[PDB]
Amino acid sequence: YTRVVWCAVGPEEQKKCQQWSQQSGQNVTCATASTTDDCIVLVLKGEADALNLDGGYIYTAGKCGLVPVLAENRKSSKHSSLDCVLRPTEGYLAVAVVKKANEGLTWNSLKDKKSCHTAVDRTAGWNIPMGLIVNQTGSCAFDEFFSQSCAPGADPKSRLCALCAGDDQGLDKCVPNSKEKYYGYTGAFRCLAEDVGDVAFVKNDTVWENTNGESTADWAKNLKREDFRLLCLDGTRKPVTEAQSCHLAVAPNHAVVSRSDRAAHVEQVLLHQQALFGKNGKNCPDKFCLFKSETKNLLFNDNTECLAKLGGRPTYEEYLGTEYVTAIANLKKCS
């Protein structure tokens, strides 16, 4: 009797999760919460077993005792002869993106501009950029760096939320789930694409996946990569093809966390589940694809190839890396 309860963040993930439950013969069922932290709470109470998390949340969950089970592994180059589930994850590139036409905008002139973040507490969208900015400005008043922003999870009436648009009925403004138009990698990038913001803190892959026809969504179908630039830390601006030499940091892959006593089962289930609905899963695209959601990245990132076994039975600190963990610890000393 090993039934796994997943935690969906927001009505859209709940929707996708219920389809997954249905297709899984209920070997996976769904619990739902409004925020990722709520989801972490539910798992602590055991009202839920697991969920996929950005490194920044892995940190919250980890302090609460939850452990990494499997990590997101997207398309790779080296190590590729090895099975995706046995391959070492290579982390992703956190980057700062802006419109090319917004000439003279560099890392060194971000003050009092408009920013777009995936969400408060996330790795590329917040921990890395805010950590860097707090450090470089020698000030903890990061809610006063940019003139306005959309940083889901912040006070809805604060300027950190001024650019957020809420759902299609204008409700839920700045919630840290996908109902907020500018939430996550995609929402933040869109916030920049529509010029609501001057800079978006997302990862390298997001710029590629929503440009040059990679996304047919209405706001993105017509975006061109040439019209965007990455802000390197040395003050220069580079084409989005140079992320390898123009990024804020390399971030650990999003990963699944669960309680310890549920970790083995949750692992067994997911290894089986992705065999069915994973990339070449026996039932995707036929019945259900676990790693697709019309680019909204629900439950898992849309570019995930598989969930990979972790080498060394890593604690959340070993998974995230002492460096990142310290960077977070340091940034959190601010609020």
Binding site: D37, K63, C64, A329
Partner: peptide
């Protein structure tokens, strides 16, 4: 440092 936020 340590202590769960919840």
């Amino acid at each position: 440092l340590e202590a769960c936020a919840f």
